[PDB]
Structures are given as structure tokens and as C-alpha cells.
Amino acid sequence: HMQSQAISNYENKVEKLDTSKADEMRAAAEVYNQTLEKGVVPNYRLSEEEKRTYNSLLDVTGTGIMAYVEIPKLGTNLPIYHGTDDAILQVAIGHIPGSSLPVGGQGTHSVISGHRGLPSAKLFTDIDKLKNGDRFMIHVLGKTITYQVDQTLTVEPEDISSLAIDPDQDYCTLVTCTPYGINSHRLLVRGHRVPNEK
Ligand code: NA
Numbered sequence: 620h621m622q623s624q625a626i627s628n629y630e631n632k633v634e635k636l637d638t639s640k641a642d643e644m645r646a647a648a649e650v651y652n653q654t655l656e657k658g659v660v661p662n663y664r665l666s667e668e669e670k671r672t673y674n675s676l677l678d679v680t681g682t683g684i685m686a687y688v689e690i691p692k693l694g695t696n697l698p699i700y701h702g703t704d705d706a707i708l709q710v711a712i713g714h715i716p717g718s719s720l721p722v723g724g725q726g727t728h729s730v731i732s733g734h735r736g737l738p739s740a741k742l743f744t745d746i747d748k749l750k751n752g753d754r755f756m757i758h759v760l761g762k763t764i765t766y767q768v769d770q771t772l773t774v775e776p777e778d779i780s781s782l783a784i785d786p787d788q789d790y791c792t793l794v795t796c797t798p799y800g801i802n803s804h805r806l807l808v809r810g811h812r813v814p815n816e817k
């Protein structure tokens with residue numbers, strides 16, 4: 620509802636950027652991605668300096684919306700905020716700081732999550748319905764990037780080893796809470812980069 624309008628605002632801002640500036644902003648995100656450690660358990664603890672850098676990238680709207688995710692099977696369209704934005708994470712999807720920014724490329728693994736969302740917000744609560752072969756799309760600065768689901772893991776909240784950046788791959792993982800028993804777990808739905816469809 621508010622998400623619908625955040626996405627429209629994002630699109631309007633994008634449509635007003637010159638292609639040159641869109642490309643410059645995207646390239647700056649790719650350059651940052653290249654600086655991240657790879658082949659190791661991710662470090663999701665940023666220093667203040669690193670947070671400053673992170674917050675200044677892909678801030679199209681000035682409200683911290685970097686992109687939006689589309690999941691046709693679920694009818695999903697959701698704005699993706701910086702994961703330091705915090706208040707807004709109770710009602711919107713957050714990119715996990717320290718993971719690759721969602722612009723794709725070899726040697727990237729971006730993580731976007733609804734795990735801090737309020738139960739009533741319904742963020743990614745349907746992703747357990749995704750099967751291997753289903754598609755989702757990140758729309759970032761006028762460019763569309765497509766992922767095909769290839770993995771579905773239910774893990775204890777501490778187990779982030781599968782979120783490591785592989786230098787030969789381009790992955791995006793969608794994350795949500797999955798409550799069962801008297802405890803809380805995490806569902807990680809990974810996709811690998813594939814070409815955009817016609
Ligand atoms: Na890493």
C-alpha cells in the first residue's frame with residue numbers, strides 16, 4: 620500500500636536520471652562490491668565509516684530505496700531499503716549491509732530480507748512457495764536483473780555460511796523468518812543470475 624507508492628516514487632526518480640548518471644551510480648555500486656571479501660563467512664559488522672559509504676550508494680530517492688524486487692509467482696513488488704534504515708525495516712524489505720549491493724555481476728551475493736518485519740506486514744512470508752526454476756527480478760536504476768531459484772535452506776539464525784560470496788557466481792538470497800515449534804528459524808531462498816526474458 621505504502622510500498623506501492625514507494626515503488627512509484629522510485630520509478631519517477633529513475634525516469635528523471637540521465638542514463639549517464641544511472642550508469643555512474645550503478646558502477647559505483649559494482650566497484651564497492653568488488654572491494655568486499657569473498658570465499659569466507661560474511662562479516663556483517665560495519666564500522667561507522669563503512670556505514671557512511673554504504674548509505675551513500677544507490678540512494679536514488681534520498682529515502683534509502685536502492686531498488687525493488689518483483690516475484691511474479693507470488694504477485695510481489697517490494698521496495699528494498701538500506702539495512703541500516705532500521706525503523707522502516709518493521710514494514711519494508713532491507714538489504715543486508717555487508718552483502719553485495721543488488722546490481723549483480725560475477726563475484727556477487729546480495730541478501731535482501733524481511734526477517735525484521737512485523738508479522739502483520741507479510742514480508743516474504745510466501746517465499747516458501749518458491750520452487751527451483753521460479754524467477755525473481757531486481758529492478759535497479761532502470762536495469763532489470765533476473766534470478767532463478769536453485770536452493771531453499773531452513774537454518775538456525777546464526778548460520779550464515781551459505782551467504783558467502785563466490786567469485787565465479789552471481790547469487791541473490793531472499794530471507795524471512797519461519798516460525799515452527801516454539802522457536803524461530805530463517806528461510807534462505809537463493810537464485811542464480813540468468814538472462815532477462817522477452
Ligand atoms: Na563477504
Ligand code: NA
Binds near residue numbers: 652653655719727784
Ligand atoms: Na561482491
Ligand SMILES: [Zn+2]
Binds near residue numbers: 802
Ligand atoms: Zn532449531
